[PDB]
Homo-oligomer: 368 residues x 2
């Protein structure tokens, strides 16, 4: 157990989180939402921890989005409620989903397929509880396209065809395309295509008589630079912004000072004959995100001089012509990982710190 | 709990292991070693489970190699002994290492740096126990090159400079370069460069008077097609062969029938407007190994027709012009992952089966 310990005292490789940075990230996104006049429903998948959920949620333990039934149950058991399973409701695990809707005052599910609604129907919840259903709009991975006449009919059906077993809480979209383009202006344009498509859809819905109280979008990039139009929605659901990473920095969503996550690693040997540092962080600790080369999986914090040139399971190789006196064996470098969500998924524990001292240990759930 | 359950009954995504295939893989490598006249010291990092260790080890719980101190302790607590930490002994965790050498009759460590030997010296074990040290030869990631005069002096020092605190058990090499070349003949040539360099080194050692009882090499590819020269060594230490994977199949180390591992996934929706299957297996369940594109992370077992065209954290997209009637929502496809070690590291549980029925659950250790 490590409360109090100095950072460069931990066993490496080690996922570290700056709690100052994390808190500041959480509170910032909360304020952006207050300013817009919308609810924040953070997504917990970047961290999958109760503590994380607490920060994002501002201390309330209400209003989150999860990516799996394992997260759903984990947070449910930790006392969270108003939990949205942001994922095409899994018709093969409805007993579990129904279990959760029965325990919780508000467990939400998403669908984008009529047969999904059918499945829900033949598994009524009872107890005067209704499937709280959101319609996923693909404005292009999953969901119905808002211009497809079929989207309209499905929304219709969810909302009205069986008002005592199923209800339409709102429409749900994730502008995850912001992940394939560079700089604020493109990010914002995707934010705009997405906001207006959703607003058009809700407009059509009102015109046709389909009640639809809520309207949800957001990714870390588009909620890092919200556009005025977003205030006409009811809620934003980013998640990763609580940690950020190199990718987000390269995207422009955030300045380096915003990135709360590192993976600490040790120089465990020099190789002059190849001009390389050897570090005790391989891909088991980092993931191969940012290669598709290895140079892009992470940067060395405060050392633009060095880059990653190789990763094995438990080893990494670093290059400069080098300077092995500057990096004695036993020294700790702090790696900035490319994709927070991915690195985090490799760690059974996060060392959370303030002022260089470990202040807490968060343990993520995992699995399905 | 799932003992007995039919495969297509599990919650997906799910790592599955054919125990018939696994056993057969273990016993085969055991026989190759018997035939060669050498000891098998399997590496456990592809699976990191006690059950796995049991198979590889033939039921004995003795003679393994681990990639971390977490594995070392996990196996030590499960009753394994004669455990080699195949990794530049971590001078920053010597209290732990010393802890393990004291509990175990044989805990082995590797080094390739004089200062490492120095570190070992100022942390004597006591109790008439000696650091059991192997010399890592880089015949090109870590270790001393056998032609570097310095290799000779270091071996010398390990063996003789302090015979009551430190001993040289043998020389250790991993021909992990077989991972960058294609087909039996290149694999075998690397096997040969490596075997002879080691044999030359041991020859030099004998000539100079440096006792060196053991001599260890091996990777899954080179021990899948052992070369006669290998019989002059004392031990082989592959690991992955117990599961195999697409990579190994693409390399030629094994036929598809040899690959014990799958990740089961469900078709959770169709998208005609894009000719794509949606599956509940993203990278959280698979890893991004085999991209550096996504088509190469895995193949669909019995369906050369389909390929992976996208992975998100919890989603995968499949393509053919398609045929959505052949793949009803709820059907299970069995993905063949590229790199067993990497996929396995994403699963807190392996569903182990015979004749389509879950016969066991293995739980891997993880962390550092
Ligand atoms: C469906 C869905 N919506 C929203 C989010 C949150 O977006 P981000 O991770 O970019 O913050 C995620 C992740 C997601 O998978
Ligand atoms: C140092 C070392 N030696 C041997 C092995 C086993 O080789 P393979 O995984 O190819 O079976 C591994 C893995 C390893 O990391």
């Amino acid at each position: 157990m490590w409360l109090g310990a100095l950072l460069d005292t931990l066993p490496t490789p080690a996922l570290t989180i700056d709690r100052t940075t994390a808190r500041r990230n959480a509170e910032r996104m909360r304020e952006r939402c207050r300013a817009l006049g919308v609810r924040l429903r953070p997504h917990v998948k970047t961290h999958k921890t109760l503590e994380g959920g607490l920060l994002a949620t501002g201390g309330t333990r209400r209003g989150i989005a999860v990516s799996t039934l394992a997260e759903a149950r984990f947070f449910a058991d930790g006392g969270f409620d108003d939990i949205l399973l942001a994922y095409p409701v899994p018709t093969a695990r409805l007993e579990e989903c129904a279990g959760l809707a029965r325990r919780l005052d508000a467990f939400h599910v998403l669908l984008d397929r009529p047969e999904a609604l059918a499945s829900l129907r033949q598994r009524p919840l009872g107890h005067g509880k209704r499937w709280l259903v959101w319609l996923k709009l693909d404005c292009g991975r999953a969901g119905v396209r808002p211009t497809d006449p079929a989207a309209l009919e499905l929304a219709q059906a969810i909302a009205n065809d069986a008002p005592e077993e199923v209800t339409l809480v709102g429409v749900y979209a994730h502008c995850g395309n912001t992940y394939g383009c560079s700089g604020a202006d493109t990010i914002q344009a995707i934010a705009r295509t997405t906001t207006n498509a959703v607003l058009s859809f809700v407009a059509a819905l009102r015109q046709a008589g389909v009640p639809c109280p809520q309207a949800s979008i957001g990714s870390t990039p588009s909620c890092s630079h919200p556009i005025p139009e977003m205030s006409q929605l009811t809620e934003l659901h980013p998640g990763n912004y609580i940690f950020y990473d190199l990718q987000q920095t390269q995207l422009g969503s955030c300045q380096p000072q915003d990135v709360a996550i590192r993976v600490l690693t040790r120089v465990i040997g020099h190789y002059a004959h190849r001009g390389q540092l050897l570090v005790d962080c391989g891909w088991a600790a980092l993931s191969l995100h940012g290669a598709g080369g290895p140079q892009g999986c992470a940067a060395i914090d405060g050392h633009p001089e060095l880059r990653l040139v190789g990763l094995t399971q438990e080893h990494g190789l670093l290059e400069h012509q080098m300077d092995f006196g500057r990096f004695p064996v036993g020294s700790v470098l702090a790696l900035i990982p490319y994709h927070a969500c991915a690195t985090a998924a490799m760690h059974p524990v996060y060392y959370v710190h303030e002022e260089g001292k470990v202040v807490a240990l968060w343990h993520p759930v995992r699995g399905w």
